[PDB]
């Protein structure tokens with residue numbers, strides 16, 4: 001039984017240590033924050049991507065056609081799965097920030113609005129990380145889930161076991177990371193975030209020679225219903241902020257001809273717990 005708060009965006013200042021409460025005190029596990037962006041803004045950014053006047057976002061669309069036709073497509077390289085040099089990731093991330101800033105037209109700016117939310121919920125400065133030579137990480141990527149596609153079950157803290165995380169681990173507290181995302185467009189059915197009470201467990205994972213074999217077993221656990229779940233279908237402009245680092249989660253298959261498009265990533269404390277970093 002994971003515990004999520006449902007508040008409005010005008011209420012964030014009433015929860016000034018929410019992020020500390022989720023990560024450090026562990027007194028609840030996530031929150032939905034309604035209307036972080038206006039619906040008009042979501043519809044505007046959506047039309048930019050549909051029509052192709054997207055500031056170049058289309059140039060960093062990764063269709064993932066080598067992962068099968070059941071996988072999400074993504075604008076921008078996600079850091080998960082990147083090689084530890086991060087060269088291609090840093091390039092896509094610069095393109096992403098410019099395209100994103102173009103599409104949002106400051107009405108409101110994506111980075112500014114997301115940073116304001118995280119600040120209100122922590123009382124701390126908020127920053128996008130920079131690489132060892134000053135390269136910018138991306139604040140977010142955009143996931144595009146067409147009809148019949150899903151995001152398979154996974155857990156966020158596995159990032160801390162990947163070579164892509166090497167540099168980020170020098171800046172981070174190494175406690176749980178949170179997930180955050182905001183729908184731009186929502187599908188007619190499906191496309192639901194499901195979060196399970198099954199937790200990240202590197203101890204169990206180390207008994208497997210191939211992580212794929214370990215995930216095949218996680219899939220059996222969650223499909224046996226042994227684990228409790230909660231499920232959410234935020235609307236356009238609502239933000240979902242949750243302990244995806246600790247808890248396995250997935251997004252259910254999209255149904256119908258309207259794609260699910262979501263913008264988001266992750267956040268976590270700095271080494272000394274005196275700043276919020278956020279990235280994708």
Ligand SMILES: O=C(O)CCC(=O)C(=O)O
Pocket residue numbers: 143151156179180181244249250251262263264265
């Ligand atoms: O639906 C999305 O854009 C991402 C879902 C997810 O896996 C996360 O927020 O960590």
Ligand code: NI
Pocket residue numbers: 154155156179244249
């Ligand atoms: Ni995730």
Ligand code: NI
Pocket residue numbers: 189190192233
């Ligand atoms: Ni539904």
